[PDB]
Every structure is written in structure tokens, then in C-alpha cells.
Amino acid sequence: ELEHITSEYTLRNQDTFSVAVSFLTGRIVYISEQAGVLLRCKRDVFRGARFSELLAPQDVGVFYGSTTPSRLPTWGKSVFCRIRGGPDPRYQPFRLTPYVTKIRCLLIAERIHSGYEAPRIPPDKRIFTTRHTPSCLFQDVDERAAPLLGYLPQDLLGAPVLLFLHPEDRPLMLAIHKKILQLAGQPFDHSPIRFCARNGEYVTMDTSWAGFVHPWSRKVAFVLGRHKVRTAPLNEDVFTPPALDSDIQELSEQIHRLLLQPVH
Amino acid sequence: DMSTYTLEELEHITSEYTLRNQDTFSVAVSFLTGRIVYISEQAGVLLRCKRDVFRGARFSELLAPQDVGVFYGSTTPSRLPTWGTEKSVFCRIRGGRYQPFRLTPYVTKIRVAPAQPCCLLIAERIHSGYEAPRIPPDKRIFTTRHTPSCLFQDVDERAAPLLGYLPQDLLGAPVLLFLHPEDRPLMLAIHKKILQLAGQPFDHSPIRFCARNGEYVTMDTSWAGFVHPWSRKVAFVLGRHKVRTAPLNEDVFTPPDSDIQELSEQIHRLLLQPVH
């Protein structure tokens, strides 16, 4: 039944709403009053609509990933998907933290905001971590990357680190990985690096790298980065897309090479 | 026009993939409906079912529901590599029950007289390691990585041929659950020895893992924490396990208390320590 129960948290958190889906039979079963407000769209559209086609295509995968009836907790662990928006374009970042019940899959959707918008993140806490393979592919990214660069974990996980760098700084990475190979585990500071924010705009970071030697193989297993936002961008709307290109595969392949030497 | 192949061109080309390899078939699915536009001759053979109850099926519906999520994840139109000009997943596929396949998805244009983009999939059956071609005993190893809260953060693909689990089965799940109830309290001690040492490895056989099938397989394990550079705490544990004895049941893929919530939190608490 329900409905009051969504009108639960939102008076303390303005940015959230709720949604129940039948899975994987029916779809949109229920939804809070304020999904309309948040998604700027009258619930005349919260029809018997496929919840999945409110998501963006990149996010559908991770969504179905997390919402397996099997691995779900009971109402009484989260992912980020972009949600339209109105039939497109027009998308919004939400944290979805899902659960299981039966109605007469329930998830809390909290909308995500820039670090560069009121409420701003203290510039001294604009920090985020990243982990990447020796082949120079993102193995992991901190949730803090989203409000600071505009990217959900899925956008980077598996993508080439180098592609998210400003080309002028892409040559810098070999030296950096050379010093990582030295020190063999020890972190070193090295400023600055520009990352491309999802809005196309560049944002300068103060960086630190360490990298982890595999205890058995003595080869480097992955590289750690701790970055601090030096300068905020103009366009604080990092979340929304805009709409020498192989320095990348080239330079990646050099680092990977360099990284294959064991260090004892 | 080269970018777009035909069904006949596909039936031929795949009968070459499934020539130097017998555990593979191909499937193209429409991006519009997820319907199977072309399945290749080997599928019926591998899936022990007629090619009748095929074409027009929503390929997703042939998967196990748990594998469905990792499928849609990697068959994203935008992240897919184009065929013949690449990052796979593992899904169990319904037969006549399920079988394990490595799925390597691609994009391409398929005709059947106007041309339509489709997801093309290379499906290769996964086999036991305790089966011809057996994995040599001294190479029967897999690596694991888990968080200080004791959740699998990563597992090696060797896990599948040795215990029956695809990566999705373990990622995010409780390490201690895949262990024998009796060897669970053992982890405490292991996590102290890790906390005795900033991450140098230490051998400690034996530990028993459940095998999805659901048999116990004794492992010779070793462990090593990764001291987080900037935290000086242990950021995650590493295990390197070798199969001590093979299970009697070679077919580990096919399936048959709350000490678990407790010990984990205990172990996690431990790892809060600054080290030493």
C-alpha cells in the first residue's frame, strides 16, 4: 500500500524520492510525489512506464546489476544512474540505494549535486581517489569523483586514464609512473594535472601517486591517485555533456611496458 | 558495403570460429528488442536444444536472472567494440539446465535487405579445471581481494573453473559465507597475523571453500594486507590459494548461521587499527 512512507525522509532531505518496481515482470508500480518536482515532469508520465527507460542507456547495466532480487536487503549498497527528465536530454544524477518488498524492489533516489554549487564542498575537502591497472585503465574510482568531475563510476571503470587527461599533460604520466616504479609503494606528490570534467571543461588537481607491488609476483598491480581540486571550473554544472588523438594508446602501452618489470 | 554482413556470410564465418574451437557459438541480438536475429549452428549442439525454440527469443531470457545485469552492463552500444576492425563477461545460459559461457560482445551491421545494428556475441563454454584439459595441480590457483568489512572486492577468473562461481556471484558478497562454518573463526587469527605485518605474505593451509555444487575444496592459502599509503591502515586483504585436493564432483558449476554478520564486524574492527 504505502505512500506516507516516502513522505518520510524528504522533509530532512529535499533531494530524494522513492520508486517501487515489479521485477522483472511489471515496472513502475509506485513513486513519491516529488519525483515530479525533482525530475521537473508531471507524474502523468510515471505511467506504467518501464522504469529502465527513464535511466540513461549506460546506467541500465549497473542498475540491473544491483537490483537482483537475490542479493537485495529487505526494507525495514548503492549505485548511481542518470534519470530523465522528460521524453527526449535532459538528465539528472541520482544515488539509488535499492531494497526488496512486495506492494499492494524499492529504491531511494537521492539527487547528486556539484561540489561547485551551493552547498559547496570545502576546497580542502575536494579530494577523490582513483585506482588504475598497469595497462592504464581505471580499476576503481571514489564516489567523490561525481560531484567534482561529473562522472559516475561506470563512465571511468575500464576506460583509459589517459583519455580523461588534458593532452598537454598526457606526456607527464610516463615520468610519473617511472618514479612510481621507483619507491615501489611509496607515494609522491606531483602537481598539477588537468582532468576533463564531464561538461568538457578542464579542472586542475594537486596529485599524489603510490601504486601497489603485488606481494607474490613483485610486479606493480595497480596505481593509486589522491587528487585535490586546485581550481574550480566556471561551468559548475560538471554533470551534463556538451555535444594527436592517439597519444593515448601509444603512451598507455609505454607505461604498461615500464610497469611489467618486477621490483624486488 | 563491407561494414554490414549477411546471415549467410555470418553462418559461414562462424563455422570457422567453431572449427578451431568446439565450445563456441555466435549470436546477434537486435538493439531494438533484444531479440535473437541470428544464432549459429553450434548453439543447439552446446545448449542441448533445437534451433526451433531459438530465433525470436529475447536473448536476456535465456540467461540466469543473476547474470542478466552484468550482460546489459557490457552490451552498452557506446562501449562495445566494432566487429573485425575485447572485454567479456560470464553468463550461465539455459539449455536442456544452465551452462557457463564467456561472452565477448561486439557491435556490427546485419542484414537478413536493409541494414540494422546488432550486438554480436562470441560465446565460449567454460569448463571445470578438474576436467580434460585439466588444470595442472601446481597451477590450480586463484587470487582474491576483500575489504576490511570482509566483502569480496575482486576475484580472479580462475575462481570459476575451480569453484563454479562467476565474478558476479562473489563481488560484493561475504567472504566468510563461502568458507566452511568450521573454518570461519580461523579468519580472525589470519587477520591478526596480517595485522602483525604491514603486508608481507604468509602461508597458512588449510581452509575449505564451498564449491557452488556444493562441495568443499581444501585450499592452501596465503594472505597479505595492503597498508593504505595515506591511511597507514590495512585497505584490503589479498589471498593466494592453491587447491589442496580436488572435489569428488568434478562439475563445480552446477548447484545442488549468523556467525557471518558477527565475525565480519569483529574482523573489520581489527583493521581499524593503525597497524602493528
UniProtKB/Swiss-Prot annotation, chain B:
Substitution effect: residue 230 to E: Abolishes homodimerization
Annotated compartments: Nucleus; Cytoplasm
Induction of synthesis: In the suprachiasmatic nucleus (SCN), behaves like a day-type oscillator, with maximum expression during the light period. Oscillations are maintained under constant darkness and are responsive to changes of the light/dark cycles. There is a 4 hour time delay between PER1 and PER2 oscillations. The expression rhythms appear to originate from retina. In liver, peak levels at CT9. In the SCN, levels increase by light exposure during subjective night. Circadian oscillations also observed in skeletal muscle, bladder, lumbar spinal cord and liver but not in testis.
Ranges spanned by the short sequence motif Nuclear export signal 2, renumbered to the chain: 263-272
Disruption phenotype: Animals show disrupted circadian behavior. The prolongation of light exposure produces larger phase delay of behavioral rhythm compared to wild-types. Double knocknouts for PER2 and PER1 show an abrupt loss of rhythmicity immediately upon transfer to exprosure to constant darkness. Animals have largely affected the water intake (polydipsia) and urine volume (polyuria).
Tissue expression pattern: In brain, highest expression is observed in the SCN. Highly expressed in the pyramidal cell layer of the piriform cortex, the periventricular part of the caudate-putamen, many thalamic nuclei, and the granular layer of the cerebellar cortex. Weaker expression is detected in most area of the brain, including cortical and non cortical structures. Expression but no oscillations occurs in the glomerular and mitral cell layers of the olfactory bulb, the internal granular layer of the cerebellum, the cornu ammonis and dentate gyrus of the hippocampus, the cerebral and piriform cortices.
Residue ranges occupied by any PAC domain in the UniProt entry: 204-247
Domain PAS positions: 13-80, 130-196
PTM per Swiss-Prot/TrEMBL: Phosphorylated on serine residues by CSNK1D, CSNK1E and probably also by CSNK1G2. Phosphorylation by CSNK1D or CSNK1E promotes nuclear location of PER proteins as well as ubiquitination and subsequent degradation. May be dephosphorylated by PP1. Ubiquitinated; requires phosphorylation by CSNK1E and interaction with BTRC and FBXW11. Deubiquitinated by USP2.
Subunit field text: Homodimer. Component of the circadian core oscillator, which includes the CRY proteins, CLOCK or NPAS2, BMAL1 or BMAL2, CSNK1D and/or CSNK1E, TIMELESS, and the PER proteins. Interacts directly with TIMELESS. Interacts directly with PER2, PER3, CRY1 and CRY2. Interacts with BMAL1 and CLOCK. Interacts with GPRASP1. Interacts (phosphorylated) with BTRC and FBXW11; the interactions trigger proteasomal degradation. Interacts with NONO and SFPQ. Interacts with WDR5. Interacts with U2AF1L4 (Isoform 3). Interacts with USP2. Interacts with HNF4A.
Function according to Swiss-Prot or TrEMBL: Transcriptional repressor which forms a core component of the circadian clock. The circadian clock, an internal time-keeping system, regulates various physiological processes through the generation of approximately 24 hour circadian rhythms in gene expression, which are translated into rhythms in metabolism and behavior. It is derived from the Latin roots 'circa' (about) and 'diem' (day) and acts as an important regulator of a wide array of physiological functions including metabolism, sleep, body temperature, blood pressure, endocrine, immune, cardiovascular, and renal function.
Name of the featured protein: Period circadian protein homolog 1
Originating organism: Mus musculus
Boundaries of the shown chain within the full protein: 196 to 502 of 1291
